[PDB]
Amino acid sequence: SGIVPTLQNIVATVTLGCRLDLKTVALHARNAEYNPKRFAAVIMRIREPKTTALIFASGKMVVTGAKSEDDSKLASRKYARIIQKIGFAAKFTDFKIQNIVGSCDVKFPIRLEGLAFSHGTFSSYEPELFPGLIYRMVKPKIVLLIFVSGKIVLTGAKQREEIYQAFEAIYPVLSEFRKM
DNA sequence: AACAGTAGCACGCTGTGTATATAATAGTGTGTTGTACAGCACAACTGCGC
């Protein structure tokens, strides 16, 4: 082994606590998009940490694109400050990470059909529909996308340890189904 | 007759469908409920006439 998964995307939610006028928000923000007809939220962005926020009239906000939990909270506080600077009585509350995505490379090809047959109740593999095997782990409850190349995607985690836990649990199985 | 330029065709590369999680919230679609409108031979009935 020796491989440890790399975090790729962190999704979080934040309650600003006050109602927002989206045209005002979009108008005053330096990096905003807002087309009511397409989606009901201002799509705001900041350069550091590089992230994207979906800002709603209710004052709720979704922050995505961060590569670390630190970066997620940091960028979230920053978006909240922007809203304040524009003039609303916003508050940075209820910061919570909802989804963590990770990925790695085991460095060997995998026999997906064998794995799907062996771990049938957790696996779903339809190569004509999507080339990767969808593995639904029980403990921890994580979803893994397994590819012939040996590249692995882990998602559905609320905490970093779950990403790490799942990979540790899957590695022996990937080894059992290697090609070379 | 030869050379240069322009147009057309073919090939290669980049971008967007499929799948995973996860939050946000008002809309859109579907289903259900309510209201309104549109071959014998003999056996029995029944029908007609006295």
Curated annotation (Swiss-Prot):
Bridged cysteine pairs (disulfide): none
Name listed for the protein in its UniProt record: TATA-box-binding protein
Span within the parent record: 61 to 240 of 240
Sequence repeats: 7-83, 97-174
Primary localization class, coarse: nucleus
UniProt-recorded Gene Ontology molecular function terms: chromatin binding; disordered domain specific binding; DNA binding, bending; DNA-binding transcription factor binding; RNA polymerase I general transcription initiation factor binding; RNA polymerase II core promoter sequence-specific DNA binding; RNA polymerase II general transcription initiation factor activity; RNA polymerase II-specific DNA-binding transcription factor binding
Biological processes per GO annotation: DNA-templated transcription initiation; negative regulation of DNA-templated transcription; nucleolar large rRNA transcription by RNA polymerase I; positive regulation of transcription by RNA polymerase II; regulation of transcription by RNA polymerase III; RNA polymerase I preinitiation complex assembly; RNA polymerase II preinitiation complex assembly; RNA polymerase III preinitiation complex assembly
Subunit structure: Binds DNA as monomer. The 1.2 MDa TFIID complex is composed of TATA binding protein (TBP) and the 14 TBP-associated factors. One copy of each TAF1, TAF2, TAF3, TAF7, TAF8, TAF11, TAF13, two copies of each TAF4, TAF5, TAF6, TAF9, TAF10, TAF12, and three copies of TAF14. Interacts with TFC8.
Cellular component, GO annotation: nucleoplasm; nucleus; protein-containing complex; transcription factor TFIIA complex; transcription factor TFIID complex; transcription factor TFIIIB complex; transcription regulator complex
Family note: Belongs to the TBP family.
Role, per record: General transcription factor that functions at the core of the DNA-binding general transcription factor complex TFIID. Binding of TFIID to a promoter (with or without TATA element) is the initial step in preinitiation complex (PIC) formation. TFIID plays a key role in the regulation of gene expression by RNA polymerase II through different activities such as transcription activator interaction, core promoter recognition and selectivity, TFIIA and TFIIB interaction, chromatin modification (histone acetylation by TAF1), facilitation of DNA opening and initiation of transcription.
Lineage, broadest ranks: Eukaryota, Fungi, Dikarya, Ascomycota, Saccharomycotina
Keywords: DNA-binding, Nucleus, Repeat, Transcription
